[PDB]
């Protein structure tokens, strides 16, 4: 079993930056090494095979070199659609093994989130639970503070957040804060507000709604 | 006596472009493949479905020798199951290939000062090529919704393109010559054998 | 075009067996090896084995030896992989992969070329005690006049489903621009939940209809939902 | 000349403006290569709509393109002060011919 170590494990570079990743093998495999670019949710995509050969259909900005135990994978100018996790693979001796992976991210200009609110559906109120959703669309960086105010009282321990992966085009993020309450507790109050504080916002943005309008 | 004219194909003066790849039939001769596999003047020498060592002791129905010129990196595309411009639009090998791909650098012979533009490749085609198909049509390729009306223009391009082999080009863009030997075995008298 | 189509995602109780299918189309099936690669959620890729589409010769990794079985059917051009005695470590996505053909050297040396050009879409195998449950789809309407400002955001909430994953499309797949399907969240109840939002011009809010299609194959649940803005 | 674009469309914030771009069957009516550019005075044009209804990466959803017969139309939904610029339409007039409009000063 040939072990492969990938350096680094994560990195963040700006658009147009030159990126370099290293894959070290515990044994000598001449050039029987390949590079894959797995995007989130999709399958791995082969970019480099035999450690130096560009796969048909890969942009010229990608390259690979190395031999023996040490290999390097290089990106000339980092393009926004290059965000993925990059793996190295050997086939010199069974069994085949893969590197740890290198999650590559983009360093982008600060962008402000578009904030939307969604009250619970009339259909869901029939079922006993109520879900209020707050959407933070197309912002950067990934950090953002989302506060739920029910009748101007701060809610805690009742919300969950979900953040998308970095967009392959504009390198932004999106966030969903879902606040789940009981219908009883939901009907107790009137004003439901989502307060977003972000770097790209001069002042905290509040998107509210009154129950029953 | 009555050897196979492999020198006619490998040592030919001029080579046809990839889109118009030149096929030579080989039948009614004794084949000494040694001349090939004992030589070291080859850049890539890959064989699918048969070993080159075990060739001199085999009989086939017919042997085809296809020959053309591509660029350095595109040599990869001459192999079963490959994609790309050359493999899709110029020269496609079948997935159940039984033959040998032999390619070597020819930067000295094929390139010249100011670049050689005698070598073409097809960049556009309505559909991918079937294995061992040849399309030499020069219909203006319709890339968009525009009719094209037989004249190149907006989203209307000439289907073939020039390689432009400069002598100063990188190894990846230097002209390589390729010969593909196909060993077909049908329900016919095996007319090609070795020692 | 070359295509590897794998079977739907499955949930199986610990100790049971899963069989994943990989149907090859668009190339001669019996001319390439098929490899299997498993990837745990959040972890990296791990090799499983190789099967020979022609003769059926099989070579599994020592980690899976005795528990993984690779099957092949030439007539239907498909490859099966069965893992038995499942554990929590086996919860992962399973890919088939085709490498190119192995070639002979000029010298006559068998040179293997085990780089994976074509991959399937992946089959998620969730190993859990918990019973499957069907999702509830709710419309997230831009009741608030977010139309003022040119851009409206509508959404669908897929609440209380198990297990992963669900497929959410818009207009039967005819709308992909500005679609954000959030990753799932494991709630306190041990059920998953997610939201899928889309940003559309306010002008089209009355002209085009917006249907969200949610598909949970493990529960055979398919729900279309027409999302209309709430008029206050 | 060559296209009819009304020089002077105007609108109010929150409302929607529809700018027209009228051609013939041979330029605008027949083919689906129509583009809308916005140009602020003294700056270079910026692409807002291409291939009739396609918004490029970074254009707000307020700008929506459409077509009907021989008339393309750009609709601005979320009117803001920043939208005060010159809007040109371009279309395919045949192989090796691209035709621009007179421009509309949106107020
Ligand atoms: C081509 O010519 C060279 C040099 O005379 C010779 O060594 C080689 O074998 C020839 N090729 C073939 C296939 O006959």
Numbering used by the authors:
A (entry chain Q): 1 to 213
B (entry chain A): 333 to 527
C (entry chain P): 1 to 52, 52A, 53 to 82, 82A, 82B, 82C, 83 to 100, 100A, ...
D (entry chain L): 2 to 9, 11 to 27, 27A, 27B, 27C, 28 to 95, 95A, 96 to 105
Give excerpts from the publication.
In summary, we have isolated a panel of mAbs from plasmablasts and MBCs from COVID-19 convalescent individuals that target distinct regions of the SARS-CoV-2 spike protein. Unexpectedly, our most potent antibody CV503 (RBS-specific) also retained binding to all variants tested, whereas CV1182 and CV1206, which share a bin with this antibody, failed to bind to the Beta variant because of the E484K mutation. Consistent with these findings, CV503, CV664, and CV993 were able to neutralize the Alpha and Beta variants.
To understand the mechanism that enabled CV503 to retain binding to the SARS-CoV-2 variants, we determined the crystal structure of Fab CV503 in complex with SARS-CoV-2 RBD at 3.4-Å resolution. The structural data indicate that CV503 interferes with the binding of ACE2 to the RBD.
